[PDB]
Structure formats: C-alpha cells, structure tokens
C-alpha cells in the first residue's frame, strides 16, 4: 500500500555490503530512535520501478547510476538538493553520474569497474591479451585446472570484450546520439565471436553464472575470473593468493568495462525524505559510514574524497581505476534498461548456440533502437496529422525504415481514422482531454486496453491512429505543446507491452512488409 512514516526501508543488491549498511542503520537508530531495515530482494532493479509506480517500495534504493534516469523519467525519485559544503566533499564526476535533465536524482557512493582477478599460485603473470587465453587454458587443463571462469549470464561481464574492438551502446561525441547504437557492428561481432569460440573450444561453459565462477576461483580450480571490488571479501576469506589487474586486450585494444557509480535514490513516494537525506549525508557518506560498508564488501573508489584518499594506496583500487579509465561511465538515459535486456539475451543465445553471433546482435540492435525509432515515427505522424505539414528534419539512423514506416502509417492510419471516425469521436468526447495533466492520465488506461487480447500490426495502427486523432484535437484547442508528451506516452506503451513481438517482426521493417501493397 503506502510507505510507512517514521522508519527507513533500504534496498541494496545481495552482492554489496548490506550487513555493513545495516551497522550504519543501527548507528542512525542509536541517535534518532528511527529503525532502519536493509533488504536485498532478488531482481530489485526490476521490482523497484513496479512497486514505486504504485507509491510503495523502499524509502532508499541502491543501484549503479545507469538505471536512475529511467526511474527519474517515471517520476519515482525525489530531487537531491545537498548544500555546497556537502557537494564539495564528493568528486564532481560522481555527481555528474547522478544528474538527469539538469537535476541531481541520487547520492553517489562509489565507482565500480571490473578487473581481471588472477591466482598468483597458478599464473604468476596474468595474460596481457584475450588471444593467449586458449593456449594458457591448454597448459592449465594438463594440471587439472582451467584458465578463466566468469559470469556469462549478465552482459555487464562480457561487455568489456564486446566494446574492445568497437562495440558501443549509444555513440558519445563532444553528447550522446541515442539514435546511433553500436551493438551489431564489426567490433561487437569480433568480441562476441571470440567469447563464443572460447565456449566452442571448451575453454568456458555457456552455463557459468556468478556463483559457479566465484566458487571455482575461490576453490583454486580456475586461474582467473572477472569481477568487481565487492568480490574481494570472499576471495580474502578463501586465502587464494590473488592479484587484481588490467583486463586483457583484444586485437591490441583495451577491454572497455562499463563503469558504474553505486548510487542511493530516495523514493518520490517516501514520507521519510528528510530522514533519508540525514541518513545518506550524515551517516553513510562519512569516513566511518563508508568504512563500515567497505569492511563488509569493498565499494571500489568511493565518491567521498576524504575516504578515497585513504583507500587510493590499495593496488586493487589502482587496478579498478586503470580499468575504469580504459572503459566508459554508463549512460543513465531511460533506454539503458532496454539496451541491457537486448544484449543479455544476445550473449546468452550466442553462447548457447540458440542464435549465431550475427542473428543475436541483429536482434539486440533492433531491441536497443526500438524506443527511439518508434518515437520518431509516432511523433512525426501525430505532429503532421495535427498541423497538416510534415517535418523536414532528416530521419537520421535507420532513416529508410523510419521514412517507409511513416509512409505506410500515412496510408493505413488515415484509413483507420476514416473508417473508425464514429468510435474515435465518441471516445475522444468521453476522455475529455484538455491539457498535459489529462495526457499524463492516459498511460494506465492505454496499457490496460492495448495489453488485453491479440497482438497484431492492426491494433498498433489503431493505437497510433487514435493518437493522431487526439493530436488533431489538441492542436485545434491550442494545446499543441501536449502532442510530443502524447507521442512519448503512446511510444512507451507500445514498446513496453510488445517489445519481444516487435523484435520478432524485425521491428518497423516487419510493419512495412506487412502492409506492402
Ligand atoms: C461510438 O462507437 C463505439 C464503438 O467503439 C468500439 C471501439 N472501436 N475502436 C476502434 C475503439 C473502440 C473503443 S473500445 C477500446 C478502448 C479505448 C479506450 N477505452 C477505455 N477502450 C480509451 C483509452 C485509450 C486507449 C488507446 C489510446 C490510444 C491513443 C491515445 F491517444 C489515447 C488512447 C486512449 O488505445 C487503446 C489501444 C488501441 C485501440 C483499440 C484496440 O486495441 O483494438 N481499439 C478498439 C480502440 C478504440 C478507440 Cl476509440 C481508441 C483506441 C483503440
Ligand atoms: O548485466 C547488466 C547489468 O549491468 C550492471 O549491473 C551490475 C552492477 O552495476 C554491479 O554493481 C554488480 O552488481 O553487477 C551487476 C551485474 O550483474 C548495470 O548496473 C545493470 O543495470 C545491468 O542490468
């Protein structure tokens, strides 16, 4: 139901120092009498947006910064307004990671990058290249060991290799070009082909997950793993003689890990926002607060300058920041969730042999592009229907598909508006859409109606065609400013409800083919 006033509920991932965070919670309770409950639910990054949308969930959510732009866009996060004195205590680049549309939407905690972790008793010198790992595995298999095991179920761990020879998520030049996705280029293919060849040649197993890789490294059965600072605690307990070092190069180029800033957001529906701010600023983001978490599971390079100066002498942190420098700080754009879902499926299907590398990355490209391509088509159709004049701007990336989808939608959507004028006029009058607040109300009812019953291109045409019908109404009553929000809302409904179906149709190319006369 509603978040309980007078306590704090905190969500953090089960691989992080949640017992250390609970100790900070106990210090908070000692001062204030306010009880702090720390939970680590499974899939909390997927659960948070579901429960927070209903005004429920934790007061504070911890995740890497990449997921907070989506949460902020969805209205699920309170704006963070620390004073200059507090802001100056953290590195400016960490605040940049938690800025979305010019507003701070979380507190940055620590910088995370993957490193190569190696067993000095099996491999005194780690391999500098991915290319030498097959030969090393052959040497180690003769000793009853293997070279490398890491999580193949989460694309976070394979991304550094995919990115090495030129794979990218969203092109960054000067600003992100969200229309420019680098998932199915020659560089991405080269990296994922290398991983699949390691599996084909029995150097790795497609079924290896976080738990299997951690157990094999910590038992001394595999010489190397790929993991973040949080993993170091369990390796210390195992008494493995380990090193943390630069990831291997691929085709002479560095592995490029996607760099995360562990961040703490405040639930927009929390009645405990002042308690949450007090906890995060004056208990957690202190030398003693971060020490308590770091002693449980290491954070990496903490955002708090005073404590980072103390930790920076650690060679494992130096290695973390060397890999971070060769990588890229993740975007926080709302499309990151879709990007990760698309690439997760691609790596798992390529690794298992369900798809070829070409097939897998083609689907991942379509899934990653789906929101922005859908919005380009739907925004243009609604606006030209409302105003009577087309947009002269270039379509940009995958422009032929956008142009031909808009041409098709002009033919079939104009026909739907003509033939279903009665139902459209009746429903427009019942909805009584007057302003941007009324447009924002449509999402819930649209999802309900559209998600029920059969999936086909005709119902997608009806969804967008009624959008155009509403947009014409909005322009006429001098609410033209409502049209882009309406287009965004319809696009969100379409892509969230029909993601998997749309990718199976080759997205908008399927639409053009389906309605080809
Ligand atoms: C006077 O005669 C009566 C006969 O009428 C029967 C009929 N025939 N037709 C064609 C539709 C209907 C009503 S029953 C479906 C319905 C629609 C709504 N409610 C509450 N119920 C309003 C909530 C809503 C739903 C939207 C919206 C999309 C863009 C937008 F800007 C605002 C939207 C608001 O999209 C749902 C999926 C697309 C859709 C479909 C579909 O999926 O097939 N149908 C059948 C629609 C009908 C209408 Cl009028 C509008 C849209 C659809
Ligand atoms: O695998 C995709 C996944 O990558 C990142 O998640 C990391 C997280 O940042 C780390 O702190 C650690 O918990 O491992 C996770 C990988 O299992 C992204 O932050 C996440 O959004 C994305 O889904």
- With a CB cutoff of 8 Å and minimum separation 6, the contacts of 424 are 417, 465, 466, 469
What is the rounded distance in angstroms from the CA atom of residue 480 to the CA atom of residue 492? 20
511 lines ligand 2 (CB under 6 A): no
155 lines ligand 2 (CB under 6 A): yes
Cα 417 to Cα 411: distance, rounded to the nearest angstrom: 10
Q: What's the CA gap between 149 and 205, in Å, rounded? A: 8
Residue 243 DSSP SS3:
strand
Check if 115-254 and 335-515 are the same fold: no
Report the b/e string of 167-182 with b at 16+ CB within 10 A. bbbbeeeeeeebbbbb
**Which two structure tokens, joined as six digits, stand for 345?**
């499926």
Cβ atoms within 10 Å, residue 331:
19
| CA–CA dist 375, 402 (Å, integer) | 10
- Distance of CA 483 from the midpoint of ligand 1 (Å): 18
- Cβ of 331 closer than 6 Å to ligand 2, yes or no, is no
> Ligand 1 atom closest to Cα of 424?
49
Q: How many CB atoms lie within 10 A of CB 353?
A: 11
Residue 38 bridge partners (DSSP) = 10
Instruction: Confirm if 263 and 65 have CB atoms less than 8 A apart.
Output: yes
The residues, any chain, with a CB within 8 Å of residue 360's CB and separated by 6 or more, are: 192, 345, 346, 347, 349, 350
CA distance linking residue 344 with residue 372, whole number of Å? 20
Whether 156 is in the pocket of ligand 2, judged by its Cβ within 6 Å, is yes
Task: Please tell me the residue having the least CA distance from ligand 2 atom 10.
Answer: 64
Ligand 1: centre distance to CA 426 (Å) = 10
Give the residue from 98, 59, 62, 66 showing the smallest Cα distance to 81.
98
The 10 Å Cβ neighbour count of residue 50 is 11
Ligand lying closest to the C-alpha of residue 111: 2
Looking at the DSSP assignment, which residues form a beta bridge with residue 11? 39, 61
Contact 370, 506 (CB under 8 A): no
Phi, psi of 333 (to 5 degrees): -60, 150
User: Is residue 71 within 6 Å of ligand 2 at its C-beta?
Assistant: no
State the pairing for strand pair 258-266/328-329.
Answer: parallel
Which run of H or E residues covers position 484? helix 483-504
**2/9 Cα distance (integer angstroms):** 12
Residue whose CB lies within 8 A of the most ligand 1 atoms, among 374, 420, 427, 456, for a mutation test:
427
- Cα 254 from Cα 249, distance rounded (Å): 4
Domain 335-515, CATH: 1.10.437.10
Name the residue among 6, 4, 7, 36 with its Cα closest to residue 22: 36
Distance 390 CA to ligand 1 centre (A): 26
Choose the CATH number for 115-254 among 3.40.50.1820, 3.30.70.20, 3.30.230.70, 3.40.190.10: 3.40.190.10
Are 458 and 417 in contact by the 8 Å Cβ rule? The answer is no
- Residues 158/347, Cβ–Cβ less than 8 Å: yes
CB atoms within 10 A of CB 45: 19
Q: How many Cβ atoms from other residues are within 10 Å of residue 33's Cβ?
A: 8
């Amino acid at each position: 139901g509603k978040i309980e006033e007078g306590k704090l509920v905190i969500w953090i991932n089960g691989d992080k120092g949640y017992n250390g965070l609970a100790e900070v919670g106990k210090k908070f309770e000692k001062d204030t009498g306010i009880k702090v409950t720390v939970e680590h639910p499974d899939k909390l990054e997927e659960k948070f947006p579901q429960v927070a949308a209903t005004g429920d969930g934790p007061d504070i959510i911890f995740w890497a910064h990449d997921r907070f732009g989506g949460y902020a866009q969805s209205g699920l996060l309170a704006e963070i307004t620390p004073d200059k004195a507090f802001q100056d205590k953290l590195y400016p680049f960490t605040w940049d990671a938690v800025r979305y549309n010019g507003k701070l939407i979380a507190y940055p905690i620590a910088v995370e990058a993957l490193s190569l972790i190696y067993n000095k008793d099996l491999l005194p010198n780690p391999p500098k290249t991915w290319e030498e790992i097959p030969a090393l595995d052959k040497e180690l298999k003769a000793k009853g060991k293997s070279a490398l095991m890491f999580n193949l179920q989460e694309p976070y761990f394979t991304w550094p290799l995919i990115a090495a020879d030129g794979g990218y998520a969203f092109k960054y030049e000067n600003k992100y070009d969200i229309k420019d996705v680098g998932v199915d280029n020659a560089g991405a293919k080269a990296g994922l082909t290398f991983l699949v060849d390691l599996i084909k040649n029995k150097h790795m197993n497609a079924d290896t997950d976080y738990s299997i890789a951690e157990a094999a490294f910590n038992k001394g059965e595999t010489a190397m793993t790929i993991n973040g600072p949080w993993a170091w605690s369990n390796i210390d307990t195992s008494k493995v003689n380990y090193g943390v070092t630069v990831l291997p190069t691929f085709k002479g180029q560095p592995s490029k890990p996607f760099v995360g800033v562990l961040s703490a957001g405040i639930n927009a529906a929390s009645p405990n926002k002042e308690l949450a701010k007090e906890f995060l600023e004056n208990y957690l983001l202190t030398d003693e607060g971060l020490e308590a978490v770091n002693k449980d599971k290491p954070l990496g390079a903490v955002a708090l300058k005073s404590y980072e100066e103390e930790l920076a002498k650690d060679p494992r942190i130096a290695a973390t920041m060397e890999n971070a420098q060769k990588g890229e700080i993740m975007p926080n754009i709302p499309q990151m969730s879709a990007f990760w879902y698309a690439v997760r499926t691609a790596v798992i299907n390529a690794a298992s042999g369900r798809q070829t590398v070409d097939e897998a990355l083609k689907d991942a490209q379509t899934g990653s592009e789906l929101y922005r391509q859908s919005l380009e088509i739907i925004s243009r159709y609604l606006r030209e229907q409302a105003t009577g004049a087309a947009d002269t701007a270039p379509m940009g990336a995958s422009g032929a598909t956008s142009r031909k989808a808009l041409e098709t939608l002009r033919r079939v959507g104009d026909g739907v508006q003509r033939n279903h004028e009665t139902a459209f006029q009746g429903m427009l009058r019942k909805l009584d859409i007057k302003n941007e607040d009324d447009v924002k109300s449509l999402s819930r009812v649209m999802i309900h109606v559209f998600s029920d019953g059969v999936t086909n291109w005709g119902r997608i045409v009806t969804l967008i065609s009624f959008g155009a019908f509403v947009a014409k109404h909005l322009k006429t009553i001098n609410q033209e400013s409502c049209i882009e929000p309406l287009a965004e809302s319809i696009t969100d409904v379409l892509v969230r409800t029909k993601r998997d179906w749309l990718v199976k149709q080759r997205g908008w190319d399927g639409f053009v083919e389906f309605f080809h006369v």
